[PDB]
């Protein structure tokens, strides 16, 4: 007996669940009331582990102890090119173990551990068990869990490996833009479709040209851009008010890791604000040596810091397309995945891109990934 199988979109920068309750898919919200949790880990003083939003909002002058993009290093080598390079960038201790990446911090007490990629990826799998069983009532063992149309077979087995460590028989393992068109319908229609899905997500954008053949996909071609997402666009926030206070105050915040954690926070919600408001208010009680911030930030203005970054996203499409032997009108569908396509701007240019044509976004972008995941899981459960 299976039980009642979940769908899980095991993200980059943020994971989500989703399942079949009453006849309906459900996207749970966790114990935050958030339907999505960010993929990271950290350690209270007390060694007390902390998983999701706790981890990431948790305020530390040691954010080396912090850790996340777990999935840009699982079920890779040592010496793959991707793995040399983000470890130039993780602000964590990515260390050779055995030939292969593992990741080293300390985890209170003065303890210090090692962890290979899946057991961090094991321990966000744990927490996304733990809302839905939550949710259901009941233990949850078996789970269809997606990754990205690039993955390869290593990467796969790994997804399935973090499983394992975390009580999880990941039953099947299930692409990304794929599982987007699922939660559609896009799969339970007769005929032939070509299908777009545009996935600008916390920390990677992917592109991918799905064909659907009476119920069968085919993934097409996929460009994109594996460092480009909504972080980024933070950023270029973050660097235009610490600029800006430098020029009021003469004070460089950047030497305090408390005062910038705060003020990342704050952007991101600002961003997330300006998605439905023209403008957002920044605020920060003893922000830096014991004085306030407080700044407002235009969504014309956060469009124009970000606004080579969002255009920037129109060449991987037009790769794609090339790729698949496409044209723009070949399109029958764009889906649009991720909590950065909410963004006016991103959806206004993706729309002028196809010359009028209504992306879709009738499913949150955040959460279609695991709903097509939670469809899937359906047919398997017992
Ligand atoms: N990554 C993001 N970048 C920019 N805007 C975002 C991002 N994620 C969400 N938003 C915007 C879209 C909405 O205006 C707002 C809230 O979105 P979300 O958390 O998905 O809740 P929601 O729209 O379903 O509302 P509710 O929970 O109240 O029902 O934030
Ligand atoms: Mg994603």
């Known amino acids: 007996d ?7 979109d095991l993200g ?60 840009r290093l699982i079920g890779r080598t040592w010496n793959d090119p991707s793995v040399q390079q983000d470890i130039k960038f993780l602000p964590f201790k990515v260390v050779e173990k055995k030939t292969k990446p593992y990741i080293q911090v300390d985890i209170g007490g003065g303890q210090t551990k ?18 839905a069983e939550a949710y259901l009532g009941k233990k949850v063992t078996h789970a269809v869990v997606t990754v990205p149309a690039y993955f390869n077979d290593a990467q796969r087995q790994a997804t399935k490996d973090a499983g394992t460590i975390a009580g999880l028989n990941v039953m099947r393992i299930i692409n990304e833009p794929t599982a987007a068109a699922i939660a559609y319908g896009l799969d339970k229609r007769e005929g032939e479709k070509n299908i777009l899905v545009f996935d600008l997500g916390g920390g990677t954008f992917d592109v991918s040209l799905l064909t659907i ?15 480009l997402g909504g972080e980024d666009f933070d950023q270029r926030v973050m660097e235009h008010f610490i600029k800006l206070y430098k020029k009021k105050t003469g004070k460089d915040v950047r030497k305090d ?20 408001q023209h403008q957002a ?27 080579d970054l969002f255009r ?22 764009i889906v649009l995945v991720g909590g950065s396509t909410r963004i006016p701007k991103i959806q206004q240019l993706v729309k002028e891109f196809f010359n009028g044509k209504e992306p879709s976004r009738g499913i949150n972008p955040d959460e279609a990934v695991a709903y097509g995941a939670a469809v899937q899981a359906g047919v398997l459960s017992g």
């Open 257 to 276: 890791n408390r005062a910038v954690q705060k003020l990342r926070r704050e952007v991101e919600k600002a961003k997330r604000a300006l998605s439905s």
């Open 12 to 71: 980059t920068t943020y994971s989500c669940v989703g399942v079949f309750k009453n006849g309906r898919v459900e996207i749970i919200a966790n114990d935050q009331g958030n339907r999505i949790t960010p993929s990271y880990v950290a350690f209270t003083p007390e060694g007390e582990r902390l998983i999701g939003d706790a981890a990431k909002n948790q305020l530390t002058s040691n954010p080396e102890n912090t850790v996340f993009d777990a999935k």
């Open 2 to 8: 299976v039980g009642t199988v979940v769908g899980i």
């Open 114 to 131: 090692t962890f290979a990629p899946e057991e961090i990826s094991a321990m966000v799998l744990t927490k996304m068990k733990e809302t």
């Open 312 to 333: 920037s996203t129109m060449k991987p499409v037009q790769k794609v397309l090339e790729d698949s032997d496409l044209k723009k009108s070949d399109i029958d569908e």
């Open 213 to 227: 053949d009476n119920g069968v996909f085919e993934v097409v071609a996929t460009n994109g851009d594996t460092h």
């Open 281 to 307: 208010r920044i605020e920060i009680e003893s922000f830096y040596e014991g004085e306030d911030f407080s700044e407002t930030l235009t969504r014309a203005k956060f469009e124009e810091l970000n606004m």
